[PDB]
From Swiss-Prot, chains A, B, C, D:
Function statement: D-galactose specific lectin.
Note: Binds one manganese (or another transition metal) ion and one calcium ion. The metal ions are essential for the saccharide-binding and cell-agglutinating activities.
Protein name, entry field: Galactose-binding lectin
Highest taxon in the source lineage: Eukaryota
Residues of the full protein shown: 24 to 255 of 273
Family: Belongs to the leguminous lectin family.
Oligomer status and interactors: Homotetramer.
Binding positions for Ca(2+) per the UniProt entry: D123, Y125, N127, D132
Keyword Iron found: no
Outcome reported for the amino acid change (mutating K162I): In minor form
Positions bound to Mn(2+): E121, D123, D132, H137
UniProt keyword list: Calcium, Lectin, Manganese, Metal-binding, Signal
GO terms, molecular function: carbohydrate binding; metal ion binding
Keyword Manganese: yes
C-alpha cells in the first residue's frame, strides 16, 4: 500500500515541506497565522508541499485518510470576528483565486462562492450571499462555500479547538469531530465522492480570510495526517 | 448539552471507574489483559462503570461520540493466535453470556453468534460458523459476530495499534480509523441506528476471548472518550 | 495516576452521571434546584454518581483535587431565607439522614448536628444549637454542622456566587475562595485529614435544606472537578 | 474592604496596565512571549503596572487573593527546553537583577539564587546549584530559586496549562492547582507569611529565562486576579 504520513507539532518559515500563500506568517511560537490584521480582504493559505495521490487511474482505488489538527481564532479590538478557517483539498496547482475579495469566500472561492476544492469550514460569520446558517457553524464544502451541509457550532475567542477527520473511501464518507473548550464534541458527516470531484494528485491545507471590517486572529497550531491507498 | 468525558493513560485494580468482568487482570505496567492464557474458552471484559445516556425518549435526540484507544495482541508459544478484541456498546446490565464458549463469540454473543450489542471487532481467526472473511479483519457488528461489514486487516504480534472512532448521530454513521505499526491506515464505516438497536442507557467497553487451542495476549493500553447529547 | 474529571455547564434529569436524592429537581434552564418550596423540612442532594477513590489503603496515598462551582440563593415571599447550601464529601453509601429535620442540619447531619462527612457550607441562618456565628458565613465542616472554622460572608438574594476549592493532599489543606457579586473575594482554609475522616471511596455533591418557616430557592448552576491519586 | 480585580483574556504592548521588562514581546494573537529565542541568557518579565496593597502597617491585616492564569511552554529545534516560568510577587520597584545570567535564576534572582520575591515556579531544568529535584517540577519560592517546597510535574511542549492560586491570609497558606493536558491535576501548598517577607505594596507578574544552550518558547495566554484586604 501507498501511505503519506506526517506530523507538525510546530511550523517554521524555512521549511520546504509547506507552501505559504498570500498573507500567511509563522509566529515565533511556531504557530501559523493565516490572515494579516492590518490588511483589507486579507487571505492566507498553507499547503503540505508534497502532492498526495488520493486515487489511482490504473486500479480505480481511492485512498482513505485520518487527520488531526488544532487551531485558535481570537477576537481583535474594533473588528467583527470573521471570517473563519477552512481545511481544504484541492488540485496540486491551487492558488488564492485571482482578485480574491477574501471575507465569506474563505480564500478558496470566487465572489459567487465557487471554486475547485473539498473542505471542512469553521465559519464565524453569516454570509446571506452563500446561504450561511444564522450562527457559527462547521460545514462540508464541495466546490462551493454554499456548504453541502452544516452543523451549529460556537467559535470561542482564544480557545484551542481540536479536530479529527476520517475519510472512508469504501462508503465515500467524510466524518468530522470537533472538540470545544467547554468539553462538548460537535460532529458532522457527509458522503463526498473524492474520486469524482478532485484530480489523482491533490494538495491538503488550510485557508482563512477577512474583509475591510471583518478581521480576527486565525492560527494553525498543529497538524498530523495519514493517507493510505491500496495498490493491488 | 450533556457530555461524558474521560481519559485513561493507564489502568489499575480498584479504580471504581472500570467494571471488570471474567478473566481480566491489570498488569504492573498499567495495561489491561483481557484473557487468561492458562484457561480454556477464556473471556474477559472491561466496562466504563458509569452508564452513558446515548439517546433520550423525551427529545428523540441521539448523542455523537469521539473515542480513541490503543491495544496490543501478542502470540504465545504453541497456541493459535486467537480470537481477537471487540470494542462494544451494550445495555447497562451487560454480562458475559451464560455458558460462553469464548472463541469466535468474542465474549459478547451466544454459540449461534447472537447477542445484544453494537461493536467494532479486531478479529484474528476465521470462524466459518459466523461467516468470517478468510483473513484478519476489522468488522462492524450489530447484535451478531456475523459482521454487517468487514475490511481486510493484519494483526501484527507485539504491535501497538491505535484506533479512532467517530459516531455522527445526524447521519447515524459509525466511522473507524485503525493505525498499524507499519504506518498504513485501515478504515471502515457503517450506518448504525443506535436509537433503534440499543436502550437509552448503555455501557461502553472491550471484550476478548480464546478457545482450547486458540489463545493470545489481548491488551488494552489506553482509552479516551467524549460523548455529547443535545438537550433541548 | 488515577484521575476523575468532569464539567457541567448545565444539568438534566436522567443524566446517569448524577444521583438525585430527596427534593431535587432540574429546571428548564438546566439549573439544579435543591429544595422544594412547598414542603416542610425540605432536603435535596445531588451527588456525582461515580465513587471517587480519594485514598488507597495499599500505598497510603491521598488524592488532591480542584473543583469549581456556581450557585444562587434567592428569597421567596413570606418565608425566612434559609437554610443554605453545603458542598460535601461522604462515604459512597451516603443518603439523607433518616428522619432528617432539614433546617440547620443542611441535609447532611442528625438533629444534634452530627454526621459522617467533610464539607464547605454557605450558611444563611444562625442556629444557636450548632454554635453558628451571628451572620451569614462560609464554614469548613468535619462530621458536624458545628463548623471547625467559619469566615463572615453575605448571601445576596438572586446573586450568582463562584467558588473554587483546592485540596492539597501533602499538607492536607482544604482551601476555599468565594467570589461575591460586589467583586470582593472571601477565603477560608483548614487542614483536614481526608484519609483519617473518610473511607477510601467517597461521593462528592451538594445538599440544601429548609424548615417549616425557613425556605428559599437553592440553585446549583455549574460544577467542574478534577481529582488525581498517585498509584503504585 | 479594599479590592483589586482585573482580567486579561489577551495583552497588548501598547496598554499602560502592564509593565514590560527585558526581552518580552506581545504576539499578534495577544500572547505574551517572555524570552527571546535568538538571545544568550534571555530574561523577560511582566508586571501588573498598579502596585497592590497586600498588607497594612496600620491594622496589621493581610489580604487574601484568588488568581488564575494560563501558559504554554514549547520546545525549539537545537536547544534544551529551558528554564521555565515563575509567577511572582515582589517590591513595587522590582527590576531584572543587574547582570542577570538568566538560566536557573528564572529572571528573579542573582547567580547564588537569592532575591526579594515570593513565587510559584514551573521549572523545566534541574539546576544542582539551586538543589532542584531531578525532574520537571512546580515549586513555592521564598526569596530563593532553591524552593521551600517542590512537587514533581511534567512540562508538555505546546500544551496549554491552567493554574489556580489561592492565598488565604488567616492561615497564611499559598495553595496552587495546576491542570495538565493529560487530564491530571498537580497541587502544592505552603505556609508563606507575606507580611514578614514582602513590603505593604507589591507588584504581581511573570518572569522566564534562558541560557546559551537552554532556550524554549515561554507564553502567558491569560490572567485573572482578585485580592481583598479588610480595612476595618
Ligand atoms: Ca461565512
Ligand atoms: Ca473470528
Ligand atoms: Ca445555620
Ligand atoms: Ca532549574
Ligand atoms: Mn458557511
Ligand atoms: Mn469476524
Ligand atoms: Mn453554620
Ligand atoms: Mn526549581
Amino acid at each position: 500500500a501507498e501511505t503519506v504520513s506526517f506530523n507538525f507539532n510546530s511550523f517554521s518559515e524555512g521549511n520546504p515541506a509547506i507552501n505559504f500563500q498570500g498573507d500567511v506568517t509563522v509566529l515565533s511560537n511556531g504557530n501559523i497565522q493565516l490572515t494579516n490584521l492590518n490588511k483589507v480582504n486579507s487571505v492566507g493559505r498553507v499547503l503540505y508541499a508534497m502532492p498526495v495521490r488520493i486515487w489511482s487511474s490504473a486500479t480505480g482505488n481511492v485512498a482513505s485518510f485520518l487527520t488531526s489538527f488544532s487551531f485558535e481564532m481570537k477576537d481583535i479590538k474594533d473588528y467583527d470576528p470573521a471570517d473563519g478557517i477552512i481545511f481544504f483539498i484541492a488540485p496540486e496547482d491551487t492558488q488564492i483565486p485571482a482578485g480574491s475579495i477574501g471575507g465569506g469566500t474563505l480564500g478558496v472561492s470566487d465572489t459567487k462562492g465557487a471554486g475547485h476544492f473539498v473542505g471542512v469550514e469553521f465559519d464565524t460569520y453569516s454570509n446571506s450571499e452563500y446561504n450561511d446558517p444564522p450562527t457559527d457553524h462547521v460545514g462540508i464544502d464541495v466546490n462551493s462555500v454554499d456548504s453541502v451541509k452544516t452543523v451549529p457550532w460556537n467559535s470561542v475567542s482564544g480557545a484551542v479547538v481540536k479536530v479529527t477527520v476520517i475519510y472512508d473511501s469504501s462508503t465515500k464518507t467524510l466524518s468530522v469531530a470537533v472538540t470545544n473548550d467547554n468539553g462538548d464534541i460537535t460532529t458532522i458527516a457527509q458522503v463526498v465522492d473524492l474520486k469524482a470531484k478532485l484530480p489523482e494528485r491533490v494538495k491538503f491545507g488550510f485557508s482563512a480570510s477577512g474583509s475591510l471590517g471583518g478581521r480576527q486572529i486565525h492560527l494553525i497550531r498543529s497538524w498530523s495526517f495519514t493517507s493510505t491507498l491500496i495498490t493491488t
